[PDB]
């Protein structure tokens, strides 16, 4: 099964929470990274996680409202209008083969 | 003249020990430390993960390291089904128990290429010699396409080649980068995805110690050479020399033996079936360690066997004083 992602909810009230669920994570992994946008891109990395150190180190796009979980889920709390749009997960497998998945959600007001 | 008899024994043993190769256990012990590290790298080096960002993921740092033969990439990864990605290991911060940085890997690659070149072409110099000079080629690639080649004047003398060895062992043991997972050697189907010091902890320890003891052997050889043997004054001077020189011979054999012991530690675990072998040569040691091992045993046993001479030389000196 190919790597999917999914947002809970897809439409998000400003001020509140969203959870980017990840389906079909491979079992053996070097690590993973989330990004803002539709692409894997250094300057837009929200956060990276090394299985090796069970340790999450944030990149430049991180707003400090993100929690990453070892099942690759990303939680974003207190969402603003600008959090709206696309997100991309890159999983690196133990054999240095990668996989991507793009995620999306919309944030409305009040 | 019974003294002159022991003097000759001390010298000729010291000449073998400090200036020989085939028949010196100091030499073969040293060579074995060096060749061991080389096999260590030929045997599992390819599976070391490198590329982790130093400053930030926004650097897409990435470089190819050439062994010639093959090339190794740091930074990148493979796209599911085919293509090469420029985003990969460079996407995650480098540190202990995760990844080596480009800079760390290039230190190793340089040391390796030097060790590899010295040993294959010049051979390890006799411990007592300043060594020949030689030129290692180190070669790398990038994209933006740029190929770089460093030519290093260097020497094949124990202290130099041991620093090269040391740079590789220390990095692995202090940083314990993860190994690539999945024909496949035993340890890979067992340690890929997990730090290298959890697969090869024992082996890096043993290697660390071989380098130390080899280093210490070199020290003692320098200062063995310092002391090479009719009033009281000549009977004391060249006689203190006897004690100093025998005490050196012994310590050297002690360390040469300890190196044989660490080699066993080295080669008794996951590398038992791989280092020692050869024949793309990654995955086995291809370093002549088996040759060097039996010769270290043989030579060491010859000297061991000559331990009366050193017992019975040390008495004569103590008698005098
Ligand atoms: Br010889
Ligand atoms: Br380059
Ligand atoms: Br071999």
Curated annotation (Swiss-Prot), chain A:
GO terms for biological process, alphabetical: angiogenesis; bile acid and bile salt transport; blood vessel development; cell adhesion; cell migration; cell-cell adhesion via plasma-membrane adhesion molecules; cellular response to insulin stimulus; common myeloid progenitor cell proliferation
Region (Required for homophilic binding): 6-109
Signals that turn on the gene: Induced in primary T cells by activation with IL-2.
The protein's name: Cell adhesion molecule CEACAM1
GO molecular function, one term: identical protein binding
Subunit relationships: Monomer. Oligomer. Heterodimer. Homodimer. Cis-dimer/oligomer (via Ig-like C2-type and/or via cytoplasmic domains); induced by trans-homophilic cell adhesion through an allosteric mechanism transmitted by the Ig-like V-type domain, and is regulated by intracellular calcium and calmodulin. Interacts (via cytoplasmic domain) with calmodulin in a calcium dependent manner; reduces homophilic cell adhesion through dissociation of dimer.
Glycan attachment residues as annotated in the record: 71, 78, 82
Family: Belongs to the immunoglobulin superfamily. CEA family.
Keyword Transmembrane: yes
Keywords assigned: Cell junction, Cell membrane, Cell projection, Cytoplasmic vesicle, Disulfide bond, Glycoprotein, Immunoglobulin domain, Membrane, Phosphoprotein, Pyrrolidone carboxylic acid, Repeat, Secreted, Signal, Transmembrane, Transmembrane helix
Cellular component GO terms held in the UniProt record: adherens junction; apical plasma membrane; basal plasma membrane; cell junction; cell surface; cell-cell junction; extracellular exosome; lateral plasma membrane
Tissue specificity field: Expressed in columnar epithelial cells of the colon (at protein level). The predominant forms expressed by T cells are those containing a long cytoplasmic domain. Expressed in granulocytes and lymphocytes. Leukocytes only express isoforms 6 and isoform 1.
Keyword hit for Glycoprotein: yes
UniProt subcellular location: Cell projection, Microvillus membrane; Apical cell membrane
Occurrences of domain Ig-like V-type (ranges): 2-109
Modified residues (Pyrrolidone carboxylic acid): 2
Recorded domain comment: Ig-like V-type domain mediates trans-homophilic cell adhesion through homodimerization and this active process is regulated by tyrosine kinase, PTPN11 and PTPN6. Ig-like C2-type and/or cytoplasmic domains mediate cis-dimer/oligomer.
């Amino acid at each position: 099964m190919q790597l999917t992602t999914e947002s809970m909810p897809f439409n998000v009230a400003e001020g509140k929470e969203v959870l980017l669920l990840v389906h079909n994570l491979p079992q053996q992994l070097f690590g993973y990274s989330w990004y803002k946008g539709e692409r894997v891109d250094g300057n837009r990395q929200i956060v990276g996680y090394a299985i090796g150190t069970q340790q999450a180190t944030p990149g430049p796009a991180n707003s400090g409202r993100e929690t990453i979980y070892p099942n690759a889920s990303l939680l974003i709390q207190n969402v603003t209008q600008n959090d709206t749009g696309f997100y991309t997960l890159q999983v690196i497998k133990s054999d240095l083969v990668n996989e991507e998945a793009t995620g999306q959600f919309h944030v409305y007001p009040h | 003249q019974a003294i002159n008899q022991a003097v000759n024994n001390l010298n000729e043993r010291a000449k073998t020990l400090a200036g020989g190769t085939t028949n010196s256990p100091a030499y073969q012990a040293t060579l074995l430390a060096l060749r061991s590290v080389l096999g260590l790298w030929n045997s599992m080096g390819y599976a070391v993960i490198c590329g982790g960002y130093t400053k930030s993921p926004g650097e897409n740092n990435q470089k190819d390291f050439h062994y010639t033969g093959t090339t190794i990439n740091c930074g990148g990864s493979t796209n599911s089904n085919g293509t090469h990605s420029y985003n990969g290991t460079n996407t995650l911060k480098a540190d202990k128990n995760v990844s080596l940085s480009i800079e760390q890997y290039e230190k190793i690659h340089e040391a390796y290429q030097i060790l590899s070149k010295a040993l294959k072409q010049a051979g390890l110099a006799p411990l007592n010699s300043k060594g020949e000079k030689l030129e290692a080629h180190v070669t790398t690639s990038k994209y933006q396409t740029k190929t770089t080649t460093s030519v290093i004047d260097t020497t094949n003398d124990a202290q130099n080649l041991l620093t090269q060895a040391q740079t590789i062992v220390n990095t692995l043991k202090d940083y314990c980068p993860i190994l690539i997972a999945k024909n496949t050697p035993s340890w890979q189907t067992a340690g890929g995805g997990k730090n290298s010091c959890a697969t090869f902890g024992a082996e890096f320890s043993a290697a660390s110690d071989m380098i130390n003891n080899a280093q210490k052997i070199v020290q003692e050889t320098q200062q063995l050479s310092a002391n090479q043997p009719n009033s009281p004054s000549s009977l004391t001077a060249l006689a203190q020399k006897m004690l100093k020189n025998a005490q050196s011979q012994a310590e050297i054999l002690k360390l040469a033996n300890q190196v044989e012991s660490d080699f066993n530690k080295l080669s008794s675990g996951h590398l038992k079936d791989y280092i020692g072998k050869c024949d793309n040569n990654w995955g086995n040691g291809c370093a002549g360690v088996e040759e060097t091992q039996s010769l270290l045993k043989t030579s060491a046993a010859d000297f061991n066997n000559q331990t009366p001479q050193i017992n019975q030389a040390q008495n004569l000196a103590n008698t005098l004083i």
